[PDB]
Amino acid sequence: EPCTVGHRRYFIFGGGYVYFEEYAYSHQLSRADVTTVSTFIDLNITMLED
């Protein structure tokens, strides 16, 4: 791609992310650190007690 100023990117690496700034490595990062938005719909089904 043609290089662009202001290149900030995250890439899935191993079990976490790797963050690059301006087409250069910046730092590793844990997956739990980036805030998570849930795409799942919760359904709480509980059983009848004996």
């Binding site: 719909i41 919760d42 359904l43 709480n44 089904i45 509980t46």
Partner: protein, 89 residues
């Protein structure tokens, strides 16, 4: 001043308890299922909006119920019924 007469069968009250317990649990769980189903449909509408842009014909055929040809008119689809043709022809 009166004397109260008591029935000899408590089984009606125990049946009431059992029915209330089962009914309450069933209504709670089915209510949760219904709410979750509603949220799921509202959630999937977003995917449908994008698959419509991707391939209008299949999305229109699925939603309308008939094999139709669709093309986007900006933010909405225009559809037209397709003429059947026998395979041997």
């Amino acid at each position: 001043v009166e004397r109260i007469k008591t029935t000899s069968s408590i089984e009606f009250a125990r049946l009431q308890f059992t029915y209330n317990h089962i009914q309450r649990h069933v209504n709670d769980m089915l209510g949760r299922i219904a709410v979750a189903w509603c949220e799921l449909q509202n959630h999937e509408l977003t995917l449908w909006n994008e698959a419509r842009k991707l391939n209008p014909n299949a999305i229109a055929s699925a939603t309308v119920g008939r094999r139709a040809s669709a093309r986007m008119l900006g933010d909405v689809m225009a559809v037209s019924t397709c003429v059947p043709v026998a395979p041997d022809n």
